[model samples]
Target: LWRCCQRVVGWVPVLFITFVVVWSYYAYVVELCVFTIFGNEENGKTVVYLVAFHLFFVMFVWSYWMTIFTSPASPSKEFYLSNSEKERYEKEFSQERQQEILRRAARALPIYTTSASKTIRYCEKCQLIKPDRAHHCSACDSCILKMDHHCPWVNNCVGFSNYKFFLLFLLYSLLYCLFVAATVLEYFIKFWTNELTDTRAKFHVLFLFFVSAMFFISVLSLFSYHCWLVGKNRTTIESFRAPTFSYGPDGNGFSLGASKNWRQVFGDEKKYWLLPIFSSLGDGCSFPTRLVGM
Candidate 1:
């Protein structure tokens, strides 16, 4: 019952996001374009503005939909201990013995990281050996592979499966706000200069401009932070506490290089770079770390 209540409450933010986006559409299309531009008899300008607005709006919403809906990836069956191994690990109370069992099981896997204590990273709840970069997300109630962070805005875990889409969502959302703010600026100034006559439209135009401008600045900061995170090949979680490798806790453990790190999330194809399609490299189970050749 508590889980159900929390699940319902979790959707409120997405609903709020949707409501704001819907109002932006109405304000831009009906109030600004239809009521004002068409009234001025600027047919050519209306076409151009509408076309550009729709383009950005569609891309932004598409990316958002993908991010919100994509379920986070989890470790595969190979990460799960076998029935015999599970029984032995559960019955054994000795910490060193448990570590020995875990290390033996993980010997064949590509895992390269361990806990801060240098022991095997194991999930007590899931009863599975965590893959490299995977972390147990409390909100998701699952071990998310390459887990970044649980984003409340999208009401989803930003991880291996949807990270590219999340980045694209931020990009397109910023673009959408930029387009709106830039295009609405002239009309906003016009209203102040006594050019726009309708009082109802004056409210919508001014409010829309302010709202988009505010969002642009806020989202710009977040987007820039994530861009830097990607360049360093680090997740939000990793940024705070660097992942512990065989050597030591190093923030740049996953970073191969700036360009290679970009390709890790965006993939190699330039054509699919801008789109919200999934093209990230690796299987979410294992990643090539900077210490691979060592």
Candidate 2:
């Protein structure tokens, strides 16, 4: 869609600039640390090669996340509700649909709503009975429940079904960034100590420094923010009360009731981390297991 392309175009510059700044610093750190640590070794070149491999590994992980988790899910018909459906529902719902929608809405809203546990009978914007977890995203122009923020990187919203992947991506990125930073730092120190201060060496070291700095700041900010929100069992949207969703301490918006919350994150022990790499089961509505423990 033109809109989709436009969205990508809008984000490309920001992503590009960020990548340049982060990768440059990372390169600088790697060069300096590598020279410092191994400049005197007879097989110093080999060590450099190995370091380069790890650098590539970090970049691969970062790129994959940008492509998969950050980019909007593959554009699918089911990925979003149709405009007509949204408009019609907003205007009013049929009596039968209203009853059904209200019931579903009640279950999900209680965790977030300040009011008593009851069917949702009114929607200020849609002017109709609302469904569970459904709230309009001004950015996406639609309602989402268990809705996370509209991720520019993913070009999609991380909601009920994809939240785990979102978290996994962040966790993995944080680890990878740390690894890169540490490795690069070692390389930079090695280079400086060896007195092999060529222009190329200096340039590489500078690049790594810039990239590492950017990576550290970005990762720490995002990781800490998300951790705090997850502890409270809330999404970015829920935290901000977007689309007019309400929340209370006793509601679903609060801390997940027990250690089972960890289970929701890790999944059944037998199949734990598998969910992050290969499948979406256990994260979606069809699964028997609940995503967030109550």
Candidate 3:
């Protein structure tokens, strides 16, 4: 009576996430969006709210979709010489000239400084030099830099690359739920109070309120958590794990100021903040400075 389920999942897990999103969307679209606005005769103000709701929904879907597909940046194998390649090189050349071949390989390697003060860890499983903040994802079976966590809901590893999109998804998801929850409250009250006579519509509206309220608090909590991590310029792994000699202090030695930290993950341009088009700057392995206290 032990668990056999692995962190690494298959299509069933992917479908599970899709099913949850699709089912929630069906409820929102039918009960809230269609029934409340399109089904009913809404005022100009209500129409505006409907439009904003749709726009935020579009942003939420786009960001979440982007986050799922965006690679969490697996460590490149080209940086270090593989055992097979090393063996082949040694076998192909004389013992004296082998050093020259190794030199050539090292010269061609694209190496970047992640941390000046800290030493890099060698991942035996990955056969690569793991950069600062790079951690092993059992689900991914690879090492990813600045990894936050593997989200089964998103069906992806949340890391520095698509972190902005994930956060935006959380933000807009919170916004969408709040908007839906608030906008539909009047009719929901009417249905509960027996002001509305239609049974089916009343039932739908009541359920809508339930799901909206449920997600309203949950999503807000998630978004707030991400915000806290962003402010500190840290990963979820760093949040829990104790300081070790390998990674050196928190945040893989990259903790700039708040604005710089936000910029590091969200990018500099305000226009790009809402959209997933522009990727956040930096190599994902390295950032500029350290925090005040840490």
Which candidate number maximizes lDDT?
A: 1
lDDT of 3 by residue, 1-294 (tens): 112345344446767756655765666666656665566676565568657867877887788789888988866656556787557664775744654555455445432322334333445576565655677887778888678898887667888787888888888778877877787787778877777666667666677678778988888887888898898877887778633432444444455767777888777788888887645887765445453322
Ordered by TM-score, highest first, the candidates read 1, 3, 2
lDDT of 2: 0.52
> What ranges in model 2 sit over 4 Å off?
1-5, 11-39, 42-131, 190-194, 242-254, 270-275, 278-294
Can you list the residue pairs that collide in candidate 3? Answer: none
- The sequence of per-residue lDDT tens digits that candidate 2 reaches over residues 1-294 is 576767668567557746764664455334444453455463665466466656655654554454344322222233233475455555665766754544454454323232243334344443333333344555555444456676666556676555667776677665555655665565566556865566766777646655656777887888788776665565675566522223323324344545544455445555645235433333232112123432
- Each prediction's TM-score versus the true structure: 0.97, 0.61, 0.77
| 1 against 3, candidate with superior TM-score | 1
Model 2 weakest 10-residue run by lDDT: 281-290
Candidate maximizing TM-score: 1
Candidate 1, superposed: residue stretches over 4 Å from native: none
What are the RMSDs of all candidates, in order?
1.2, 6.5, 6.3
Regarding TM-score, does 1 or 2 come out ahead? Answer: 1
- lDDT of every predicted structure (CA atoms): 0.92, 0.52, 0.68
**After aligning candidate 3 to the native by TM-score, how far in Å is the CA of 80 from where it should be?**
3.1
Candidate 1 accuracy as TM-score: 0.97
